[PDB]
Design a binder for this molecule. Structure first.
Ligand SMILES: CC(=O)Nc1cccc(C(=O)Nc2ccc3c(c2)CNC3)n1
Lengths: 39, 156
């Protein structure tokens, strides 16, 4: 049996840690909701 | 049950100890999470109970108590914030510029941040604080890192 616990407010944080790149990927989505890389 | 708006952890006591299997958004009395977190199962909120209302395995989304309420979209140009809620750790905002998933049915925003599977359902926000989608469904690229889609539902 699953349960929920509050973890915080949904707010934009100014001066947050800026990381991660922006890749343009060719993907496919199957009937089971799973993404896969088209190459 | 607690129905205050905000981000919530999705926990379970079926395995060893208490394990975080995912995260979700409470908004307008509706709990929104990813399908692979709950598999459509009922949730508990203190003494109260939340029952599934809408779900779709292909979109990988589910709503509890009512229809999907989140409808903000990524503008295609601006940086966004993953409000990551990792297992055993405090909620933290990470800013990133999203990439693109190019599909046969159009393009979807994608965040290239690597977090544990128990972080699935964490909201991705715009500069206004609006939820533009949830984190936790994507693909694994050559280098081994995760690239998640910015998965948004439809508001009827
Ligand atoms: C290193 C790594 O893999 N990490 C993360 C991070 C978030 C999510 C997942 C994941 O596995 N997402 C997931 C699982 C099951 C399903 C779907 C998405 C949609 N169909 C069912 N992995």
């Amino acid at each position: 049996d699953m349960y929920i616990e509050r973890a915080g407010d949904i707010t934009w944080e100014k001066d947050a840690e800026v990381t991660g790149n922006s890749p343009r990927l060719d993907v496919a989505l199957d009937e089971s909701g799973d993404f896969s890389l088209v190459e | 049950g607690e129905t205050t708006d905000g981000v919530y952890r999705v926990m379970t006591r079926r395995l060893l100890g208490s394990t975080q299997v995912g995260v979700g958004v409470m908004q307008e009395g509706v709990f929104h999470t990813m399908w692979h977190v709950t598999k459509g199962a009922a949730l508990r909120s203190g003494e109260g109970r939340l029952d599934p209302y809408w779900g779709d395995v292909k979109q990988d989304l589910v709503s509890y108590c009512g229809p999907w309420k989140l409808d903000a979209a990524w503008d295609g140009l601006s940086e966004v914030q993953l409000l990551a809620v990792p297992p055993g750790e405090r909620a933290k905002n990470i800013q990133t510029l999203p990439g693109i998933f190019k599909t046969k049915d159009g393009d979807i925003g994608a965040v290239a941040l690597d977090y544990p599977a128990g972080t699935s359902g964490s909201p991705i926000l715009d500069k206004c604080g609006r939820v533009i989608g949830l984190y936790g469904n994507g693909v694994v690229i050559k280098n081994g890192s995760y690239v998640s889609a910015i998965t948004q539902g439809k508001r009827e």
